[PDB]
Amino acid sequence: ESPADSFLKVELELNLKLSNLVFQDPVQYVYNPLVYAWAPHENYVQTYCKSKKEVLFLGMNPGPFGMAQTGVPFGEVNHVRDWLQIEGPVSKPEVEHPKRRIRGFECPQSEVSGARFWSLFKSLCGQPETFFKHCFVHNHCPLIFMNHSGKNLTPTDLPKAQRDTLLEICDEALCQAVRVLGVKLVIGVGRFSEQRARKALMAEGIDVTVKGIMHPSPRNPQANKGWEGIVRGQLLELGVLSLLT
Amino acid sequence: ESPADSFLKVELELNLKLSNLVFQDPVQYVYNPLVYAWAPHENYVQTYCKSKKEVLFLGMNPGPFGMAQTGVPFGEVNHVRDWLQIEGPVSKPEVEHPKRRIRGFECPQSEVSGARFWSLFKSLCGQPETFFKHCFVHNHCPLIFMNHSGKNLTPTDLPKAQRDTLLEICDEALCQAVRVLGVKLVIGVGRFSEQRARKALMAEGIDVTVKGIMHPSPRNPQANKGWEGIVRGQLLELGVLSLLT
DNA sequence: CCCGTGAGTCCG
DNA sequence: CGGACTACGGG
């Protein structure tokens, strides 16, 4: 029937476990847009997760100008507002670094990764209902981390102690999400997410295939030479273009 | 028109924004004399801000025995009581460091910076009404900060993240203050206020010139000999001695 | 207090 | 490998 409500419950219980973790060392700021940007996030799930899915795209964690602002995965402001047509009130984290303030849908910066991601599907699928008929998008981890100067820290940059515990907790929620959605294929966006999903799903004995595509980050020089062209070819090879229409 | 009421409204708006800030790290104590010494401050503004001004002298923030006690900029107790003839009730900060309790007009210590500053204008102008005809005095930031041992931390001493948050808020209040007072010349007292004011006011394109004089602090080795003589020379060069007499 | 030296970060 | 921007100790 509709996985939306259960998906949101997975996420709220995940938030509960993450709220009791204590980060140290180089980590000096932690944001969770599933707290302060819950409203647009809930709107995204209720609008686009009304039925069981064939394919899940999985990213690592929010980027600073995307999901950190909008609550939506790969959630670059223009594409979220104008194509996905998702809105909602956004408040702020308890402790903000001044170079990484949350302005929500008034953030003037584009998250390049997110702009690339949604531009691909806007071009391929035309309308959002066409993409979400059989697909969904989610991140392994909802937290974003920064050091003293506001520089982003990936989950892999974290001290080994906190890193392993964080990711194990996230593995467990990912497994629940995969089952709630009923997906037969998980596509990891980037190597970290592809490899982490394969490992997490194997550790709980779920027989869902896991593949990957190239991540759109402009820190990847390959992605700056024609990301969209590369990933169209990769999606053709995975045999999912018919689902995407 | 008198800008006094408009100026006080700018300060009250600033206090509201500052009251929501949370400091940490080496900051252990934060006093705002525009809360606990609002009465003498409002007396100061209502008495000496009765018309628009040509010149604004701008300090950085309060010193522990001056404005932190009296609520008046560069507000050394004797010169505030005897030359400015400003008094009023002073309460206390919510949490005091035991070596920096607020005694208000009973504070027995002299703030050297403030004594130097107001003694200069007492000698030059004679009566305060002569000084304030075309001039006014204000600080960029009304807060004073102490570490665990009660040592003063200037805004420059704060960690970058805390400093940037605070000073962006103060910059915007400064633009508003300059507008309501009609000031054509801001004189930064010290290089920090001069440079900060120039950047803030040029960013908003305010029609105002920014210059500087030497800071009178005893921590400034250049001020140890002949501060008054040096600054008289600087004031002469800035063209303001005619307005001040 | 002011400056001179210099290290963290960005170059999507 | 360069160039610009912007913590802290001595004076």
d(CA A114, CA A136): 15
- State the amino acid at position A68 in one-letter form: A
From A127's Cα to the closest Cα of chain B, the distance in A is 41
Place of tokens 């950085």: B60
Parallel, antiparallel or unpaired: strands A55-59 and B135-139: unpaired
d(CA B210, CA B187): 6
d(CA B47, CA B235): 24
Q: Which nucleotide is nearest to B216 (CA to C1')?
A: C1
Residues of A within 8 A of B161 (CB-CB) are 97-98, 148-150
Which method resolved this structure?
Answer: X-ray
Record: contact A98-B22, CB cut-off 8 A: no
CB neighbour class for B189 (10 Å; exposed up to 12, middle 13-18, buried from 19): buried
Q: How many domains does chain A have?
A: 1
Residues of B within 8 A of A148 (CB-CB) are 159, 161
CATH for A218:
3.40.470.10
Does B21 lie at the interface with A, CB-CB under 8 angstroms?
A: no
Q: Which nucleotide is nearest to A148 (CA to C1')?
A: C8
Record: contact B164-A98, CB cut-off 8 A: yes
Sequence-ordered strand ranges (E) for A73-208: 135-139, 144-146, 152-153, 185-189
Residue A218: DSSP 8-state: T
Q: Calculate helix-pair angle for A227-238, A112-125, nearest 10 degrees.
A: 50
Q: Which domain holds residue B245?
A: 1-245
Place of tokens 């600087």: B234
Record: contact B22-A97, CB cut-off 8 A: no
- CB count within 10 Å of CB A78 equals 14
Protein footprint of strand D, defined by Cβ closer than 7 Å to any strand atom: B 159-160, 219-221
Task: State residue B115 phi and psi, 5-degree precision.
Answer: -60, -45
A-B Cβ pairs (cutoff 8 Å, strict): 13
Closest CA to B91 of B114, B110, B70, B65: B70
Question: What is each CA distance from B56 to A43, A213, B84, B155, B222, in whole angstroms?
Answer: 51, 61, 17, 20, 23
- CB count within 10 Å of CB B39 equals 16
Bases of strand D lying below 7 A from some protein CB: 6-7, 11
Residues of A within 8 A of B164 (CB-CB) are 98-99
Instruction: State, as a whole number of angstroms, the distance between the CA of A238 and the C1' of C11.
Output: 35
Is B78 known to sit in a ligand binding site? no
Record: contact A150-B168, CB cut-off 8 A: no
Does A92 lie at the interface with B, CB-CB under 8 angstroms?
A: no
Does B25 lie at the interface with A, CB-CB under 8 angstroms?
A: no
Strand-pair partners of B188: B58, B212
Is A60 known to sit in a ligand binding site? yes
Record: contact B165-A98, CB cut-off 8 A: yes
Is A139 known to sit in a ligand binding site? yes
Q: The dihedral of CA B223, B228, B230, B234: what is its sign?
A: positive
Is B60 known to sit in a ligand binding site? yes
Instruction: State, as a whole number of angstroms, the distance between the CA of B217 and the C1' of C3.
Output: 16
B122-156 per-residue burial string, b: 16 or more CB within 10 A, e: under 16: bebbeebeebbbbbbbbbbbbbbbbeeeeebbbbe
